[PDB]
RNA sequence: UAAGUUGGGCACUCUAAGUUGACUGCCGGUGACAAACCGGAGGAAGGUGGGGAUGACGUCAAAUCAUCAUGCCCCUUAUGAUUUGGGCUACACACGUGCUACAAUGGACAAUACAAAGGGCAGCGAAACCGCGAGGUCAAGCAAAUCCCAUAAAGUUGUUCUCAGUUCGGAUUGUAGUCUGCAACUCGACUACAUGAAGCUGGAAUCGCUAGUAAUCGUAGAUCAGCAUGCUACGGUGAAUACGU
């Protein structure tokens, strides 16, 4: 056979999509994406790059990842995936592009500095 | 400027679920209020036994409004509202009346609520009542 | 058999040129040298205020740089030992002649 | 005053602990470090001084 | 108001006076969020007697001060300011039309 | 009354019906039940003549009782008769290891 | 607490070593914040520098309720008005 | 192999230094053609990408003689200096600031998934062992990409509680203990047992915040014999609003 891979880099989460031909199936660090990731029923929108890339589908996964909590690292997966979907066929690439997803969001978290405490909140001023 | 749109509803395919499970999100835990909104899917589609989107849909075109006011000396005026705005008020008089039931359940409050609205009764389609009597009374000395 | 060391100083390009010394005058009387492993180079924070009495919320930070370089090398004889102790400099380094 | 202070903190004990590690160059006890033995502002001094290494500065 | 006194021991004679004196502006409005007063003996060596006073006010707040021989003609001269530095405000009028 | 001591609830589970003597906690109920093998089982007094027996002696294992009280009294009274330098924080609102009185006006006090 | 267990300054000790065989004494002048009760002292009396001057206390029976280092604490009337 | 544990490979991620990259740069339009602005393409990133540092002249006779230094004055068997103890923390009260409760979006209990950063030399004390736990015994390893510190919480799965001043609540006081310290009474923290205050979202008035933000739940570090509802740093989860001025 063959087998298609790619990285993910997102939110202290990062992901090695090893992305292969195949049924469309999960199993992230041997274990499926389902109860692995609390809840969740969110993965309509982790195959909505199968809704519009070579749609329907399917291929079969693998991934290693490590780092950060489930948000990042359910939405690490996808730019590795649509990567190796460019690397698949660059000409989704048009069809990625107008609908994101190989666009890494460069945001994260930001830094301290004096004003913040336990809550993220800064201080009150002089009343009365 | 823009408002950071939610893509869809992962759950029966609608949207303002989405819209809505946020509005439950309190303290960032989306679990647990995704899970007493998808029951209150499961009592209001149980009881009188029906789609989401008859009770929904309709409740919230029961009190979903079409007129609003602001001030401006001191003129109240009479406006028409954006439907951002018009859905986004909706869905808060909804959540924000759906604890003030005063009731045990983390569903019957809102089933009961949104049964009740979809029934043109309750304090939802009460505030559009209320609200459409500040318009049309204050038409005149600000529009 | 290998023999391996550990660098420590505080400017990046003064370290890893003196690693090329050590290297060239390696492999000039041997081979089969690790090339600049590199590693993680961790830092540390040290936080003051900007005052002397009071003003505390007003301050300042600094930290400290810690480069780590891991070299090795292979099929040990006493050419790349003399290697090893004739060219360090500039000695901010902290070499750490191991086997 | 802190003149035969600084003697106290350089005095022998009854047992370990009754002592400090105030500055040197000033002789502020509090607000110091085990690392250098200085307070909170010599250290600020010099490292504008960038006497030792050092590093100072924003990274962060 | 945290009446202190900077080298001066604060009797119950001067809070009785300074309390006293504030109270003529139930006039307006009092509304007693809270007041202060700062003191001080500063040597020139002719010295001093100095007063800086401090109102908050419904939505703002005005401060006052002024310096004189001692405090009683401190807190006599700086009086009849935090009067006119707080008497106008309002009215302000009606529009629009259209 | 009704199995033990006195002022027991009807139809409330062992799991605080225990408890509400002068002297159980939660864990110490955990326990003396543990003893007859005895739970509730579960919001509710399903309690017969059957385990009646070992819950109204088991119970006796302690003074959960007015002398708990009465314990109380006169240890107290122990402390404020010999000088006493911690009866006399004893009324402040400090107990023998002290609080630093500015805000406790207050529930030790009024 | 303690390491297992009482302990005393072994110089107060040392002293109604000296004053509890014989025919006792009713004064002791002391320091004592390291050291307390415990049943040798018993018959006697101390007097306990509290930081101003000591003043006396006559060991009791069951002064158990208490211990050495304090007994009119420092604070003294009160410090408070009421 | 239980295990990247071993063989091997650095391919991948990772790892630290020089590279290329975003500069209205390319185009289209609007524009005194210029200045520019609006739009579009690509691009990982389009409009100083985000933050950090850097804070003009200067005002406040701002603050600090107690950082250090110092003009002047004053002292000098004391306005100096040594020791044991106290005190710097007392409370009818008030001000500020924070913390914790006023509950079923939940409390009690069982099983289970996920980080970042950073400390460590005689310090980090792995496993095992004792114990209701604080801790006590032992001792493998390790100046760290290693070993250890250290296990994440929120959450997920369930059971029960079923709206009480309640298993809310968690102050109060006592009892019995662990660590450190020569020493835990004025004045250390913590563990086990009991006891269960007020309090049902706070009145007028009043405060912050434009997106990974707020909000919330965790983590480490210094200060250290002992000791942070504080400070600094790290992450996890994670929205509503922004018309218009």
Partial sequence: QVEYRGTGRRKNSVARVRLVPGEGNITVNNRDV??????????????????????????????????????????????????????????????????????????????????LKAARRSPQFSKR | VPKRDVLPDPIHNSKLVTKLINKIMLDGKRGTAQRILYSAFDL???????????????????????????????????????????????????????????????????????????????????????????????????? | QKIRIRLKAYDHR?????????????????????????????????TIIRAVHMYKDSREQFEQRTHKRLIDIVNPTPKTVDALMGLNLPSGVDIEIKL | AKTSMVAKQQKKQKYAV???????????????????????????????????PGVRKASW | FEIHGDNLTITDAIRNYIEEKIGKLERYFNDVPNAVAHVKVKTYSNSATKIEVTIPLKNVTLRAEERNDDLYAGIDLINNKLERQVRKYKTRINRKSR | ARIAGVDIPREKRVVISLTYIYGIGTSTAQKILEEANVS??????????????????????????????????????????????????????????????????????? | SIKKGPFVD????????????????????????????????????????????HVPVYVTEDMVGHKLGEFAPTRTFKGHVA
């Fill in chain 1, 34 to 115: 389902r109860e692995y990731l609390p809840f969740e029923s969110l993965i309509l929108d982790l195959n909505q790059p199968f809704d519009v890339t070579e749609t329907k589908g399917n291929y079969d996964v693998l991934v290693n990842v490590h780092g950060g909590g489930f948000t990042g690292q359910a939405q690490a997966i996808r730019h590795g995936i649509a990567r190796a979907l460019l690397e698949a066929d660059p000409e989704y690439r048009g069809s990625l592009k107008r609908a994101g997803l190989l666009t890494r969001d460069p945001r994260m978290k930001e830094r301290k500095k004096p004003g």
């Fill in chain 2, 44 to 143: 209001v589609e149980q009881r009188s036994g029906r789609d989401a989107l008859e009770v929904f849909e309709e409740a919230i075109n029961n009190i979903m409004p079409v007129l609003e006011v602001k001030a401006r000396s001191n003129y109240q005026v009479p406006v028409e509202v954006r439907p951002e705005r018009r859905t986004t008020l909706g869905l808060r008089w909804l959540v924000n009346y759906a604890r003030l039931r005063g009731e045990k359940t983390m569903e019957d409050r809102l089933a009961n609520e949104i049964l009740d609205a979809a029934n043109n009764t309750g304090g939802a389609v009460k505030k559009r009542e209320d609200t459409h009597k500040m318009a049309e009374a204050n038409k005149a000395f600000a529009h």
């Fill in chain 3, 14 to 46: 003064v370290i890893d040129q003196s690693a090329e010394k050590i290297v060239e005058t390696a492999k000039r009387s041997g081979a089969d040298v690790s090339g600049p492993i590199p590693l993680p180079t961790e830092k540390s924070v040290y």
């Fill in chain 4, 18 to 52: 009754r002592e400090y590690t105030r500055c040197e160059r000033c002789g502020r006890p509090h607000s110091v470090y085990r690392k250098f033995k200085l307070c909170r502002i010599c250290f600020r001094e010099l490292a504008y001084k960038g006497q030792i």
């Fill in chain 6, 40 to 110: 509730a089982d579960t919001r509710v007094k399903d309690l017969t003549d059957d385990e009646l027996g070992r819950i109204r002696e088991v119970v006796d294992g302690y003074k959960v009782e007015g002398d708990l009280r009465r314990e109380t009294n006169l240890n107290i009274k122990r402390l404020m008769e010999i000088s006493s330098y911690r009866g006399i924080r004893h009324r402040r609102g400090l107990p023998v290891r002290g609080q630093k009185t500015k805000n406790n006006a207050r529930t030790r006090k009024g």
């Fill in chain 7, 10 to 53: 072994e110089h107060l000790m040392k002293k109604v070593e000296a004053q509890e065989g014989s025919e006792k004494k009713q004064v002791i002048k002391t320091w004592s914040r390291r050291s307390t009760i415990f049943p040798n002292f018993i018959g006697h009396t101390f007097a306990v520098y509290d930081g101003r001057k």
